[PDB]
Amino acid sequence: GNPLVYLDVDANGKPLGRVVLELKADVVPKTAENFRALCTGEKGFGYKGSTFHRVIPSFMCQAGDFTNHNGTGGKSIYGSRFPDENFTLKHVGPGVLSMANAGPNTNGSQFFICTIKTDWLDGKHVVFGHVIEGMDVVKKIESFGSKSGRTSKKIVITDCGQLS
């Protein structure tokens, strides 16, 4: 069935725990496969050692810029950017996993985990999975954000990979 992947997250060098994500490869195979491979590192690059660089309480936690660490970078397993696959899955509530972008058809590697229903992003961001385990970890990350998105602790994905 659908891949399960994990992110182990530190804040200021202290482990917060593990976020487990189910990737909806049955709905968005291309988007799911990109994220899966970026978690395993099997292409020679990916999320390990990168950060949650933008976190806004009562909104979302954003990560995946493993090249510039600031929201401008990232790349996919296909090339720098790739198309919006579909908008079938919606931003239904907390725990939704969705692609960050720079407008239409600019998916790379940046992603966010929602902490509320972000319905206004429907039809603009490709949803591709959700949190299976570790919403407590997500809430910790969230609490280290600010209105500006600047984080008050250094939030690092120390390890990541595929569980099944």
SS3 label, residue 87? coil
Is 125 assigned a catalytic role?
A: yes
> What number of H helices and E strands is found in the chain?
2, 8
Considering 36, 53, 91, 125, which one is annotated as catalytic?
Answer: 125
Considering 21, 23, 89, 121, which one is annotated as catalytic?
Answer: 121
Considering 112, 128, 130, 144, which one is annotated as catalytic?
Answer: 112
Is 121 assigned a catalytic role?
A: yes
Considering 101, 107, 128, 130, which one is annotated as catalytic?
Answer: 101
Is 35 assigned a catalytic role?
A: no
SS3 label, residue 137? helix
Is 18 assigned a catalytic role?
A: no
Question: Which 8-state DSSP code applies to residue 100?
Answer: -
Is 162 assigned a catalytic role?
A: no
Considering 34, 62, 107, 110, which one is annotated as catalytic?
Answer: 62
What distances in angstroms separate CA 84 from CA 51, 59, 77, 136, one per listed residue? Answer: 24, 22, 15, 30
Question: Which 8-state DSSP code applies to residue 102?
Answer: S
Q: In terms of DSSP bridges, do strands 127-133 and 14-23 run parallel, antiparallel, or are they unpaired?
A: antiparallel
Q: Which residues form the catalytic set?
A: 54, 59, 62, 101, 112, 121, 125
